[PDB]
């Protein structure tokens, strides 16, 4: 999975 660190982003995506 991916973890997104920034504004407006879904925090975790798979």
């Amino acid at each position, epitope marked *: 999975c*991916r*973890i997104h*660190i*920034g*504004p*407006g*982003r879904a925090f975790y995506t798979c």
Partner: antibody, heavy 131, light 112 residues
Framework: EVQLVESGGGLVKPGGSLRLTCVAS????????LNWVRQAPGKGLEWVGRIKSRTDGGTTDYAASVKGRFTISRDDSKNTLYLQMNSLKTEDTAVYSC??????????????????????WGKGTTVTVSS | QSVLTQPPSVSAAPGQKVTISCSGS????????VLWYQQFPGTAPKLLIY???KRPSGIPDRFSGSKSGTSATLGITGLQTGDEADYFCATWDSGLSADWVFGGGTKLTVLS
């Protein structure tokens, strides 16, 4: 050139409208989220709003100070970002710049991490609102 | 009245070290991650630190960052005359609109 170039700035009276354009060169424009920011004289940078990429829905978010007055849109075919400003106020006077979000990727064993930041920055265009 | 608060200026001589602080609230710095940028007059901002304390490619280890509570700090050691510039912090807000937010900037003078 790998760059963002804004145009359309000028003098407008309060209550009036103005559209800014921002043209991208040298990278895949459709892949990036874009922001508008502004900086008033003697003040610090303020974020105005964003528009996401088409793959992420193309939606827009706005600062509370401009909500309902400003609209951001994008035309991927023309590598162009727009800021439509309506009901302008004297306090909207500022240099307006566009930026892209970029990221730093860090691979992990089970998750990859993406850290976002404002990456490519335009030089700005000046908007003056005065009666 | 910038969202994040920085000292207007800091200074030290070549070879010395300085810190530049960034003060916010739980809705920004407290719960999110801090970036630092360097900006010379008439140039674009350049990223120095992301994720509170990480350095991107090409940034030397004499630049460092920390975060504590609702504050953050940029540290610069072995000052060079070429480091004289404005330095500003950034993060984002925890509301649904997720604004990017910025410090007012700090002018670093390398005393000459």
């Amino acid at each position: 050139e790998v760059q963002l170039v804004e145009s359309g700035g000028g003098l407008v009276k309060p209550g009036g409208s103005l559209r800014l354009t921002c043209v991208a060169s040298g990278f895949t424009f459709s892949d990036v989220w874009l922001n508008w920011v502004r900086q008033a004289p003697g003040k610090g940078l303020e974020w105005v709003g964003r528009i996401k990429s088409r793959t992420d829905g193309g939606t827009t978010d706005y600062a509370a100070s401009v909500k309902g007055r400003f609209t951001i849109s994008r035309d991927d075919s023309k590598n162009t970002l727009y800021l439509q400003m309506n009901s302008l106020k004297t306090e909207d006077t500022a240099v307006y710049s566009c930026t892209t979000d970029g990221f730093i990727m860090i691979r992990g064993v089970s998750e990859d991490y993406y850290y976002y930041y404002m990456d490519v920055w335009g030089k700005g265009t000046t908007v003056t609102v005065s009666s | 009245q910038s969202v994040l608060t920085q000292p207007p200026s800091v200074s030290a001589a070549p070879g010395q070290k300085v810190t530049i602080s960034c003060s916010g609230s739980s809705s920004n710095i407290g719960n999110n991650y801090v970036l630092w940028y360097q900006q010379f007059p008439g140039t674009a901002p350049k990223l120095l630190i992301y994720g509170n304390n990480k350095r991107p490619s090409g940034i030397p280890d004499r630049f460092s960052g920390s975060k504590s509570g609702t504050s953050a700090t940029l540290g610069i050691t072995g000052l060079q005359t070429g480091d004289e510039a404005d330095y500003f912090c950034a993060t984002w807000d925890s509301g649904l609109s997720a604004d990017w937010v910025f410090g007012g900037g700090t002018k670093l003078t390398v005393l000459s």
